[PDB]
């Protein structure tokens, strides 16, 4: 009855992707059914409400700004309703009324991800402290950033995914920005955040991009391998865990220079919520997982 676009956020842990455990969409559909937004048959076959997501986030991957689009009964106080049938770690942050022909998946352009990791993924395997007390130096952070900056621009990223040959056009991808933020300490443990904006991403690309920069900084490999990895010959690139991977923003920067959308598509009023959900549900869960289960310490021992 009224096609809409939802801005939503979630903690990835305990789910099996967006689309053996339940998925993010299972919780949402359940909430959509219970709120009265959609009929049961529409939940059984999501095509009937024309459901679309922008990012098929993988197992364990979180999101601060996932975007979906669908037809619903536009009930009173719809946001509160849907949210009242959802857990804490899943939130519908915003609603925008949109034209019926709209498809969020196809009409979006760039993507921004985040990677939250303990800082000992950057400790040199010989000259740095080898326990939890390690603290990222300004020199090393600088190395990390210069390395991440080498990714900027266009490249043949075939070595950062799989099942794609070097001559394959779809293997080429475009990175807009990539860097690491200044570290912070939560209860004796230090972490840091990596941000990456790309026009589009392939399977494991970000995880492999981060895995390689980790392998270099730690000193398991020389800087040379970064430029080598773009050559046609195959190079086994280390794939970092997906635990700290966070979909941050789905962009529509090129939407108007291509279309002209019953109301504009920016989430400016929801920004305080966006940050809040990140600080309350996304970040502490990742931190809690590294503290108790040691995802990163385990993956590091495999290099």
Residue numbers in the entry: 83 to 101, 108 to 348, 352 to 394
What did the article's authors report about this structure?
One of the first identified was the pseudouridine synthase 1 (hPus1p), which is a member of the TruA family despite their low sequence similarity (<20%;). We have characterised the catalytic domain of the hPus1p protein biochemically and structurally. We determined the structure of the catalytic domain of ΔhPus1p and the D146A mutant of this enzyme. The atomic model shows the typical fold for a pseudouridine synthase from the TruA family.
Crystals of hPus1p D146A belong to space group P22121, and contain one molecule per asymmetric unit. The D146A mutated protein was further shown to behave as the WT enzyme in solution. Furthermore, we observe that the D146A mutation leads to a 10-fold decrease in the affinity of the enzyme for the full-length H7 substrate (Kd of 2.2 µM instead of 0.2 µM seen with the WT enzyme) clearly indicating that removing the catalytic aspartate destabilises the complex formation. The two hPus1p structures are essentially identical. Differences between structures of ΔhPus1p and ΔhPus1p D146A are limited to external, poorly conserved loops, which confirm the flexibility of these regions previously identified by Czudnochowski et al.. The HEPES molecule is bound in the active site, and its sulphate group occupies exactly the same orientation as the sulphate from the MES molecule. Similarly, N4 of the MES and N1 of the HEPES molecule are nearly indistinguishable.
